[PDB]
Design a protein around this ligand. Sequence first.
Ligand SMILES: CCCC[C@@H](CN[C@@H](CCCC)C(=O)N[C@@H](CCC(N)=O)C(=O)N[C@@H](CCCNC(N)=[NH2+])C(N)=O)NC(=O)[C@@H](NC(=O)[C@@H](NC(C)=O)[C@@H](C)O)[C@@H](C)CC
Length: 99
Amino acid sequence: PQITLWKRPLVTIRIGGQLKEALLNTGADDTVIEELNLPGCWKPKLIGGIGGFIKVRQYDQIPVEIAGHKAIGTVLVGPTPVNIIGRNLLTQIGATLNF
Ligand SMILES: CCCC[C@@H](CN[C@@H](CCCC)C(=O)N[C@@H](CCC(N)=O)C(=O)N[C@@H](CCCNC(N)=[NH2+])C(N)=O)NC(=O)[C@@H](NC(=O)[C@@H](NC(C)=O)[C@@H](C)O)[C@@H](C)CC
């Protein structure tokens, strides 16, 4: 699709068998999802943003479907204000910025 930016670029994703809503985020290196159970093992990490740092659980090689497009990669789980799809997965679905 072509998505304009008058509204937040929110889309449906599937992760761990469950549907969620997430923000397509060119300003995020990584994909960060609200607290949930994910199958498999994780390792702790800290990530930063506009206000400081939070602690997350890093899961690797997680399948994520984003608006019907498949990705498999790193998903960070923790107390993010908004579910965000970052560049690590945006590149897998061939997403670009255009103007
Ligand atoms: C979570 C809230 C929504 C997404 C977030 C993405 N902003 C980028 C900006 C880059 C830093 C300025 C971001 O957080 N990126 C992180 C996302 C986390 C991630 N792991 O990818 C990032 O790339 N972080 C890397 C980059 C390095 C940071 N610096 C450092 N480590 N020293 C990371 N590994 O820490 N947007 C925002 O922070 C904006 N918030 C919003 O638009 C709305 N606020 C809320 C709460 O939704 C609105 C109601 O204000 C700010 C700028 C106000 C306009």
